[PDB]
Paper text:
Sequence and structural analysis of PolI_G20c revealed a 3′–5′ exonuclease domain and a DNA polymerase domain, and activity screening confirmed that both domains were functional. Since ExnV1 only includes a 3′–5′ exonuclease domain, the gene encoding ExnV1 is most likely to be truncated. It is concluded that PolI_G20c belongs to the DNA polymerase I family but lacks the typical 5′–3′ exonuclease domain. With these data at hand, the structure of PolI_G20c was determined to 2.97 Å resolution. The structure of PolI_G20c consists of two polypeptide chains, A and B, that could possibly be arranged as a dimer according to PISA structure analysis in CCP4mg. In PolI_G20c the supposed two long β-strands are only seen as one-residue β-strands 8 and 9, since there is a gap in the structure, although if all of the amino acids in the structure were seen we propose that they would resemble the long corresponding β-strands in ExnV1. The maximum activity of PolI_G20c and GoTaq was measured at about 70°C, while IsoPol BST+ exhibits maximum activity at 65°C. IsoPol BST+ also exhibited significant activity at temperatures below 40°C, whereas PolI_G20c displayed very limited activity below this temperature.
The structure of PolI_G20c was solved with the aid of the structure of an exonuclease termed ExnV1, which was determined in parallel in this work and originates from an Icelandic virus metagenome collected from several hot springs in Iceland. The gene coding for ExnV1 may be part of a truncated gene that originally encoded a DNA polymerase I. A novel structural motif, SβαR, that was not previously associated with DNA polymerases I was identified in the solved structures of ExnV1 and PolI_G20c. Residues 152–185 are missing in chain B of PolI_G20c; however, the residues corresponding to those in ExnV1 are present and from the sequence alignment it is interpreted that PolI_G20c also resembles ExnV1 in this area, which is part of a novel structure motif (SβαR) that is discussed further below. The major difference between the two proteins is that ExnV1 only comprises the smaller 3′–5′ exonuclease, whereas PolI_G20c also includes the larger palm domain that is responsible for the polymerase activity. The SβαR structural motif consists of two β-strands followed by two α-helices that are connected to each other via a short β-strand.
Author numbering: 2 to 161, 179 to 726
């Protein structure tokens, strides 16, 4: 491997090599307080790695700096590095995490997302093995046979305890290269650099406060460029493997080019744009949460006052302090200790408290107050978690111009759904009537109301009507399920009418009124039974009676029998082939087999399964996970497909619209007020379709906040 550190003199040769390269890889080395929030004023680009072949790369130092001694070469001018990247973009480009690197290039070098589109090994390799980690380090060990070296390297003698050796940097680089056969780890590189400066501090060479700082800017470029350049060469080497795999699977090659890479691009642009944040409304949520956390402590106090009487004065902060808490629950109330900490003290944790909301205390008369007391503690920690996750940890991250840049990981689930972070939009409570009535402390805590559309802009939101049921009927292919969905009939009333055999003449509207709570028991089944259903799952999860569970499950399969036969074939094909192929998209959902069974003849499998109960537990969990992913993953790709198609049409019609967020069965676009009209039209046209004869419909809304 040839590692080049580019200088003003070497730049024309690096440009010549890039121009001649058949395909190039781009990797960025950066620094920030949050190196992920590129939009904070402290964020900086340190260097750019450009690999022209799997064995040749060029490092462009941009913001490297000198620690105590003068060893760094002159950083290249920002315009020189930008011209190198622009020349590299003319050739076919490959990235490992294009969503990050393309946003780095746009923020630090002003190279718009328009120019920076390229291939992404991390996205393509997710189609090769979704159960494999996304890490470039991890994939390099898996396909390229290159483990990272995490040994402890000790430096050569850089002194002669009086004079620094003139060639000390060449001596240090050579000590590093002697152990770099498969490539040194970042931790090991830091340890050697720190050890080298510590030897210098022990001699009279340098005098620094304490330890060497963990700052890539200070790592000598001659050594650091080896690390950075290996990442770019490994990305290119991994792409060679991807092209071979795509030869074997042209259905996945087309799924990658038409849906996966374009959807990644759409969501990279969405993170880049960022949603505007109402800081005033955030303070109201923060102040309302803070008020309610305090409210819940007074509730706990008045409850404790009745629970332990006059001894309740002897406790000032029972909820917060786990000292006063374990004394109350166990020592005083006589609660059965069904969990302890590593140090053997009785555990007052979230998990342990969930258990005591079934269990009972010594005086069974105090039980309704003890229940109320633990419920107050649950609500207290519930409200307390909302603050520590999204009021302050959401306000920290807001860029100078008040926008929040939510990250989306296009390949963030084994099913194929998008992951979301900073903020995880899934874990933002959309205050649904059931969500609230279960956990009522959420009432009024609308976090999405603080996510605002810019002045002159609107949010055009569109939600797939009862998608889970549509997708279920589509993937399974039950005609009864499909026809009811197309006829707009209450699928749940059809289930309850078959499971209980009551009122076989009350229309779907009349049945809802008369046998109300039996229709809602079927509404639970129609949704939970798609992901594999047994009487055990209905009881050990929903609190169903043994009589009720059998009534419902026999009716669900009597009414929609193709669901049963479909489910039989999914579990049968998974047990034999070890994977399933997605109906319309062709995504392969492979099973995450236990380490035993991996590279083992199927005839040798029963020996493993029949003996090892841990491996069989992994096997059967992996089997259910694949079946579940067939439904979530199918709708994930349907939504992904709609996003790229609607976004392509906004671009085509010259509209000021861009898909800003997507969560659950919902797509939100940030559109200019005049364009909102047509944006909503395009949204519904690209969203509504007829999957396997099952009709998908979607109703649009013009919101000014992401709120519900």
């Amino acid at each position: 491997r040839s590692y080049h550190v580019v200088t003003n003199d070497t730049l024309p040769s690096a440009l010549d090599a890039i121009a001649q390269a058949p395909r190039v890889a781009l990797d960025t080395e950066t620094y920030g307080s949050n190196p992920f929030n590129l939009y904070l004023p402290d964020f900086r680009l340190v260097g750019v790695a450009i690999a022209t072949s799997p064995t040749e790369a060029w490092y462009f130092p941009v913001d490297h700096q000198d620690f105590l001694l003068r060893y760094q070469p002159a950083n290249l001018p920002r315009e020189a590095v930008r011209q190198a990247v622009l020349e590299a973009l003319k050739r076919p480009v490959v990235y490992h995490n294009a969503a990050y690197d393309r946003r780095v290039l746009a923020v630090t070098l002003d190279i718009p997302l328009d120019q920076t589109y390229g291939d992404d090994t991390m996205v393509a390799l997710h189609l090769v093995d979704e159960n494999h980690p996304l890490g470039l380090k991890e994939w390099a060990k898996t396909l390229l046979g290159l483990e990272e070296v995490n040994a402890d390297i000790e430096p050569p003698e850089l002194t002669d305890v009086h004079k620094l050796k003139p060639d000390w940097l060449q001596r240090l680089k050579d000590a590093f290269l002697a152990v770099h056969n498969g490539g040194v780890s970042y931790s090991a590189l830091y340890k050697l650099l720190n050890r080298a400066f510590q030897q210098l501090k022990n001699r009279g060479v340098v005098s620094y406060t304490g330890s060497f700082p963990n700052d890539f800017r200070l790592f000598p470029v001659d050594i650091a460029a080896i690390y950075a350049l290996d990442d770019a060469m490994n990305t290119l080497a991994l792409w060679e493997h991807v092209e071979v795999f795509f030869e074997l699977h042209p259905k996945l090659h087309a799924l990658y080019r038409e849906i996966e890479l374009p959807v990644n691009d759409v969501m990279t642009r969405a993170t880049h744009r960022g949603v505007l944040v109402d800081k005033e409304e955030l303070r109201r949520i923060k102040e309302t949460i803070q008020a309610r956390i305090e409210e819940k402590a007074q509730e706990a106090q008045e409850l404790l006052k009745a629970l332990i009487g006059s001894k309740a004065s002897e406790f000032t902060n029972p909820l917060n302090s786990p000292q006063q808490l374990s004394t109350i629950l166990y020592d005083l109330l006589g609660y059965p200790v069904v969990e302890t900490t590593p140090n053997g003290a009785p555990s007052t944790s979230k998990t342990a408290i969930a258990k005591l909301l079934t269990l009972s205390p010594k005086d069974k008369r105090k039980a309704p107050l003890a229940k109320a007391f633990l419920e107050a503690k649950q609500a207290h920690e519930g409200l307390k978690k909302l603050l520590s996750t999204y009021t302050d940890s959401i306000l920290e991250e807001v860029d100078p111009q008040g926008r929040l840049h939510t990250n989306f990981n296009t390949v963030g689930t084994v099913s194929g759904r998008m992951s979301s972070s900073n903020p995880n939009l899934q874990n933002l409570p959309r205050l649904l009537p059931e969500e609230v009535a279960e956990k009522p402390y959420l009432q009024g805590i609308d976090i999405r109301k603080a996510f605002v559309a810019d002045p002159g802009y609107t949010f055009v939101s569109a939600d797939y009507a009862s998608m889970e049921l549509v997708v279920c009927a589509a993937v399974s292919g039950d005609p009864t399920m499909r026809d009811l969905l197309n006829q707009g009939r209450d699928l749940h009333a059809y289930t309850a009418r078959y499971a209980f055999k009551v009122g076989l003449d009350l229309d779907d509207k009349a049945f809802k009124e008369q046998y109300k709570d039996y229709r809602q028991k079927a509404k639970v089944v129609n949704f939970a039974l798609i992901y594999g259903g047994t009487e055990f799952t209905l009881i050990k999860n929903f609190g169903f009676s043994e009589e009720e569970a059998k009534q419902l499950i026999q009716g669900y399969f009597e009414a929609y029998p193709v669901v049963k036969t479909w489910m039989e074939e999914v579990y049968r094909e998974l047990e034999e082939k070890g994977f399933v192929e997605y109906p319309i998209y062709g995504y392969i959902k492979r099973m995450d087999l236990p380490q035993a069974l991996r590279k083992l003849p199927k005839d040798k499998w029963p020996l493993v399964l029949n003996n090892d109960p841990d491996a069989r537990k992994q096997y059967y969990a992996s089997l259910r996970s694949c079946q579940n992913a067939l439904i979530q993953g199918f709708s994930a790709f349907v939504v992904k497909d709609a996003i790229v198609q609607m976004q392509r049409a906004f671009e085509a019609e010259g509209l000021d619209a861009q898909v800003i967020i997507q969560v659950h069965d919902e797509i939100v676009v940030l559109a200019k007020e005049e364009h909102a009209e047509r944006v909503a039209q395009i949204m519904v046209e690209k969203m509504e379709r007829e999957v396997n004869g099952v009709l998908l419909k979607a109703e649009p809304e013009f919101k000014r906040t992401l709120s519900k």
